[PDB]
Subunit: 90 residues, 3 copies
């Protein structure tokens, strides 16, 4: 048993975000070209995936957090995290 990670990168820098699922929680570490710091994201999950896109002045990040058969989408859109509309089936 090992922790599970997901990574994304963006920008003219570039910047990196790494999400780690451990002990039922996903946390976030971010690289800005100088150092790693802990991001604001902290939500439940045992498995994580991520994707992102940069448009305008905002990175948009989507984190898919799964526990059991429930996957929750978390959305960063420039200045905050909110729960997304993702569902695994209709």
């Amino acid at each position: 048993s090992s922790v599970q990670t997901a990574a994304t990168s963006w920008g003219t820098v570039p910047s990196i975000a790494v999400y780690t699922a451990n002990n039922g929680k996903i946390t976030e570490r971010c690289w800005d070209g100088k150092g790693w710091y802990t991001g604001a994201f902290n939500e439940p999950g045992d498995n994580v995936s991520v994707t992102s896109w940069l448009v305008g002045s905002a990175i948009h990040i989507r984190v898919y957090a799964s526990t059991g058969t429930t996957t929750t989408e978390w959305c960063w859109d420039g200045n905050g995290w909110t729960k997304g509309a993702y569902t695994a089936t209709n």
Copy 2:
């Protein structure tokens, strides 16, 4: 035990595809800027990864589906899924 996901995004929209391995099968959910729908992809796997690239009028998606020690590549190239040439070793 939790389901396992992989996510990719593309386009001036953007669009998102999320692949989920559950019960030995990988299925696909897609976002088009308005809603989530179920994609055509349905192949066996217990672990999944994905990458994609947009060139021309087609998103090209590569899904790596693993069961045991066998990983199968599935290729979307604009208008259909086909098995790729990927092998894990020579």
Copy 3:
């Protein structure tokens, strides 16, 4: 129990790299538009994630290799792999 993969793609080609964790080791397979070959990367891990970015003449790849609660970042920057500064917490 299945092997675990992570995939990234880049370039005007494009090229693909697929990393597989199996038996405690991560290995690398690469596609150049013609065939799959085995990459140089070979480091311990039970879980893997990846991201990459292309700037200049070099693909830059970051591989996050986890065993237990330890995640090690491996950095490709055009012509070699080195251990990165990533840590999971301060």
